[PDB]
């Protein structure tokens, strides 16, 4: 019942906070809505797959927080095999290699150059302060692309870059925000690696699980927080089943839209009440297709494909075979408006649709005979809102966004949507948690 801090939510962010706080001898309790920790990271384990991340999986270099943490937790990593030739799919046929129009590629990298130069103006700690904030916030990321790119290849190809990175549609997202977003990953280069990718040996879900190991029964599953009352020195916290917990500080560690569902006494300041209200989550279905053999490797196909076809389920693919070569698999995201559209469908109908995409992208009959299939659809995510992260619609960043990680009395704000480096990724979840934890620490001693 009685603790120094309560952490709302036990994804990587809430758990990171909790662990640091624990390192300093602070009494922490974690209330977590689900019957598992890990949130948007989730490793399904079953005899068909051994294990598989249906959520966040990939960590890059430069991402030292989650690397240091996982390493401490005793979790190894492995290099995602980007073995052979990448395949792009455009306008029916398919092309193997780099990106093939001159003037259009001169357009290509000019766009990524511009996006970065534009990045320079935007303070990562406060994008709302950018000299050109207003112009850029009013502006949709689609019009920006159009205003910059002279050709429709670049333009089209860019839309899909936006799709892949923020699971959303260009017309729906603030230019300011997107430009910030990329910048805060180290810019165009880093974010989307032409490209040392890694996954955790055994699942990214381990990061959370192992911290729950450290915390024991101070992590409470099936405890969705519904009220936070702050009005009297001791903070009373209520969960769905009308259990009560009291503590001296709170750390909100759940995404904006979800924070909005909690009842706050006193109310959150009007400004913030609006912000958290207006950042929608993105939309993805993550899909692992399993095959008896790694047939794509055999045709010198990497197994990673960038698909920019109108009516094709999957938009981007990666090989996902185990580090030793057992249980060959192809991981694909079906995302943004495609996710919304195909979410309706039965799992089995997606599986067939997907298989025949692969058949004709890979020109192989064996793509039609999967051995097993796993997917989580994150749109339909009650305790997540969606993946990978929250986006900013136009004008929102500057109307309310300033207040994005500011305390209210004794309530502090974590969650990857509040990081200033790799916001939206597992890395960002850590940065957030830890930052929030330290904030609480200063509010002590
Ligand atoms: C879902 C997802 C997917 C599908 C995918 C992915 C992802 C995801 N991602 C993202 C991540 O995951 C995120 O960011 C994170 O995780 C976040 O975290 P946090 O902050 O913590 O949050 P969460 O998890 O959610 O947690 C929370 C918690 O809480 C709870 N709750 C709620 N409510 C409540 C509660 N409690 C109490 N009470 C109440 N009230 C919940 O339940 C939870 O638990 C990712 N990430 C990373 O990092 N990585 C990755 O991968 C990922 N994934 C995405 C995608 C990405 N991309 C694409 C990029 C990368 C790259 O890729 C590539 C490259 C190259 C080529 Cl060629 C290809 C490709 Cl694909």
Residues 6+ apart with CB under 8 A from 102: none
Q: CA-to-CA distance for 234 and 248, rounded, in angstroms? A: 6
Spatial distance between the Cα atoms of 277 and 257, rounded to a whole number of angstroms: 6
Q: How far is the CA of 420 from the centre of ligand 1 (A)?
A: 16
Structure tokens that stand for 358 in this block: 């692969």
Backbone torsions φ then ψ of 77, nearest 5 degrees: -120, 165
Are residues 291 and 333 located together in one domain of the fold? yes
Residue 17 Cα to ligand 1 midpoint, Å, equals 17
Experimental method: X-ray
Nearest CA to ligand 1 atom 67: 304
Q: What is the distance between the alpha carbons of residues 2 and 58, in angstroms, rounded to a whole number?
A: 37
Q: Which residues contact 10 (CB under 8 A, 6 or more apart)?
A: 18, 30, 31, 32, 37, 38, 39, 208, 212, 219, 253
User: Residue 221's closest CA among 249, 205, 250, 241?
Assistant: 241
Phi/psi of residue 166, each to 5°? Answer: -120, 25
Q: What is the CATH number of the domain that holds 220?
A: 3.50.50.60
Same domain, 286 and 385: yes
Pocket of ligand 1 (CB under 6 A): 8-14, 31-34, 39-41, 55-59, 164, 193, 195, 197, 224-225, 253-255, 258, 262, 284, 286, 304, 316, 318, 378, 383-384, 387-389, 415-416, 424-427, 429
Q: Locate the ligand 1 atom nearest the alpha carbon of residue 302 and give its number.
A: 67
Residue 432 Cα to ligand 1 midpoint, Å, equals 14
Where residue 119 sits, what CATH number does that domain have? 1.10.405.10
Is the bond preceding residue 315 a cis peptide, omega within 30 degrees?
A: no
β-strand 52-53 against 43-44: which pairing, if any? antiparallel
- Let me know: does 280 contact 417? Beta carbons within 8 Å: no
Residue ending a domain, among 159, 192, 225, is: 192
Query: Cα(202)–Cα(267) distance, rounded to whole angstroms?
Result: 42
* Separation CA 131–CA 32 (nearest Å): 40
Point out the domain boundary residue: 345, 367, 389: 389
Using the mean position of ligand 1's atoms as its centre, give its distance from the Cα of residue 66 in Å. 13
Which residues make beta-bridge pairs with 225? 239
Same domain flag for 264 and 307: no
Distance CA 163, CA 165 (A): 6
Q: Verify that 35 and 155 share a domain, yes or no.
A: no
In angstroms, what is the span from residue 214 Cα to ligand 1's centroid? 22
C-alpha Rg value of the chain to the nearest Å: 22
What is the domain-level CATH number for residue 383?
3.90.660.10
Ligand 1 pocket, mutate which of 254, 319, 430 (most atoms under 8 A from CB):
254
Closest C-alpha to ligand 1, atom 31: 9
Q: In which domain, by residue range, is 164 found?
A: 101-192
Nearest alpha carbon to residue 69 among 434, 323, 384, 442:
434
Do 54 and 91 have their domain in common?
Answer: yes
Residue nearest to atom 18 of ligand 1 (CA): 429
The rounded Å distance from CA 168 to ligand 1 centre is 15
Structure tokens at 343: 């979410």
* Inter-residue contact 160 to 317 (CB < 8 Å): no
* CA–CA dist 120, 65 (Å, integer): 24
Check whether residue 105 and residue 176 sit in a common domain.
yes
The length of the chain, given as a count of residues: 445
Give the pairing type, strands 28-31 and 219-220: parallel
Alpha-carbon torsion, ordered 408, 7, 391, 303, to 10 deg: 160
- Alpha carbon 309 to chain centroid, angstroms: 24
How far is it, in rounded angstroms, from Cα 176 to Cα 178?
A: 6
Same structural domain for residues 298 and 354?
yes
**Alpha-carbon gap, residue 403 to 277, rounded angstroms:** 13
Residues 6 or more apart in contact with residue 411 via CB below 8 angstroms: 228, 230, 249, 250, 251, 252, 264
What is the residue with the minimal CA distance to atom 50 of ligand 1?
A: 56
CA of 278 to the centre of ligand 1 (A): 19
- Whether 186 and 222 map to the same domain: the answer is no
CA separation, residue 81 to residues 70, 76, 198, 203, 221 (Å)? 20, 16, 9, 16, 35
176 Cβ contact list (under 8 Å, min separation 6): 122, 127, 128, 130, 133, 136, 137, 139, 392, 397, 398
Domain boundary among 137, 165, 192: 192
SS (H, E, C) the chain: CEEEEEEECCCHHHHHHHHHHHHCCCCEEEECCCCCCCCCCCEECCCCCCCEECCCCCECCCCHHHHHHHHHCCCCEEECCCCCEEEEECCCCEEECCCCCHHHHHHHHHHHHHHHHHHHCCCCCCHHHCCCHHHHHHCEHHHHHHHHCCCHHHHHHHHHHHHHHHCCCHHHCEHHHHHHHHHCCCHHHHHCCCCCCEEECCCCHHHHHHHHHHHHHHEECCCCEEEEECCCCCEEEEECCCCEEEEEEEEECCCHHHHCCCEEECCCCHHHHHHHHHCCECCEEEEEEECCCCHHHHCCEEEEEEECCCCCCCCEEEECCCCCCCCCEEEEEEECHHHHHHHCCCHHHHHHHHHHHHHHHHCCHHHHCCCEEEEEECCCCCCCCCCCCECCCCCHHHHCHHHCCCCECCEEECCHHHCCCCECEHHHHHHHHHHHHHHHHHCCC
Q: How many CA atoms lie within 13 A of 203 on its CB side?
A: 20
- 56 C-alpha vs ligand 1 centroid, how far in Å? 4
Residues 238 and 277 in one domain: yes
**Nearest residue to 180 (alpha-carbon basis) of 390, 432, 336, 387:** 390
Q: What's the rounded Cα separation, in Å, for the pair 257 and 275?
A: 9
Do 341 and 248 share a structural domain? no
Please state, in angstroms and rounded to a whole number, the distance separating the CA atoms of residues 407 and 442.
13
Q: Which two tokens stand for residue 121?
A: 């103006």
CB 170 within 8 A of CB 106: no
Q: Are 334 and 284 in contact (CB under 8 A)?
A: yes
Gap sites in the chain (C to N > 2.5 Å), preceding residue numbers:
99, 194
Residue partners of 72: CB distance under 8 A and separation at least 6: none
115 & 168 share domain: yes
Neighbours of 185 (CB within 10 A): 22
In angstroms, what is the resolution? 3.0
**CA proximity to 10, closest of 26, 29, 23, 24:** 29
Structure tokens at 310: 């109108």
- Split into its structural domains, the chain has a count of 3
If asked whether residues 412 and 385 sit together in one domain, one would say no
- Residue 87: asked if its preceding bond is cis (omega within 30°), the reply is no
Angle, helices 175-183/141-148, rounded to nearest 10 degrees: 80
């Amino acid at each position: 019942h009685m603790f120094d801090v309560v952490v709302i939510g036990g994804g990587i962010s809430g758990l990171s906070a909790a662990k640091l706080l624990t390192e300093y001898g602070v009494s922490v309790l974690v209330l977590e809505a689900r019957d598992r920790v890990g949130g948007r990271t989730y490793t399904i384990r079953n005899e068909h797959v051994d294990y598989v991340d249906v959520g966040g999986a990939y960590v890059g270099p430069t991402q030292n927080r989650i690397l240091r943490l996982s390493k401490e937790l005793g979790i190894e990593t492995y290099k995602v095999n980007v073995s052979e030739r990448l395949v792009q799919y455009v306008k029916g046929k398919t092309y193997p290699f780099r990106g093939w129009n001159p003037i259009a590629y001169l357009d290509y990298n000019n766009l990524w150059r511009t996006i970065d130069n534009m990045g320079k103006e935007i303070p990562t700690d406060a994008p709302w302060e950018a000299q050109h904030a207003d112009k850029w916030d009013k502006m949709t990321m689609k019009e920006l692309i159009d205003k910059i790119c002279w050709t429709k290849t670049a333009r089209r190809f860019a839309y899909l870059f936006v799709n892949i990175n923020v699971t959303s549609e260009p017309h729906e997202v603030s230019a300011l925000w997107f430009l910030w977003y990329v910048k805060q990953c180290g810019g165009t280069t880093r974010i989307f690696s032409v490209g040392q990718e890694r996954k955790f040996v055994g699942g990214s879900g381990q990061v959370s699980e192992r911290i729950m190991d450290l915390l024991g029964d101070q992590v409470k599953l099936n405890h969705p927080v519904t009220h936070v009352d702050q009005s009297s020195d001791n903070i009373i916290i209520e969960t769905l089943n009308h259990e009560h917990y009291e503590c001296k500080y709170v750390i909100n560690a759940i995404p904006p839209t979800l924070t909005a569902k909690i009842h706050f006494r006193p109310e959150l300041p009007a400004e913030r009440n609006q912000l958290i209200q207006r950042l929608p989550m993105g939309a993805v279905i993550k899909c692992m297709m399993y095959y008896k053999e790694a047939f794509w490797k055999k045709k010198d196909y990497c197994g990673c494909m960038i698909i920019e076809d109108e009516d094709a389920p999957i938009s981007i693919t990666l090989d996902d075979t185990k580090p030793d070569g057992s249980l060959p698999a192809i991981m694909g995201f079906i995302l943004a408006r495609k996710a919304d559209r195909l979410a309706k469908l039965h799992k089995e109908i997606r599986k067939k649709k997907i298989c025949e995409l692969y058949a004709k992208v890979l020109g192989s009959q064996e793509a039609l005979h999967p051995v097993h299939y796993e997917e989580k659809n994150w749109c339909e995510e009650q305790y997540s809102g969606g993946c990978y992260t929250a986006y900013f619609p136009p004008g929102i960043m500057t109307q309310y966004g300033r207040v994005i990680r500011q305390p209210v009395g004794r309530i502090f704000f974590a969650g990857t949507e509040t990081a200033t480096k790799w916001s939206g990724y597992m890395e960002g979840a850590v940065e957030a948690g830890e930052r929030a934890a330290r904030e609480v620490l200063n509010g002590l001693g």
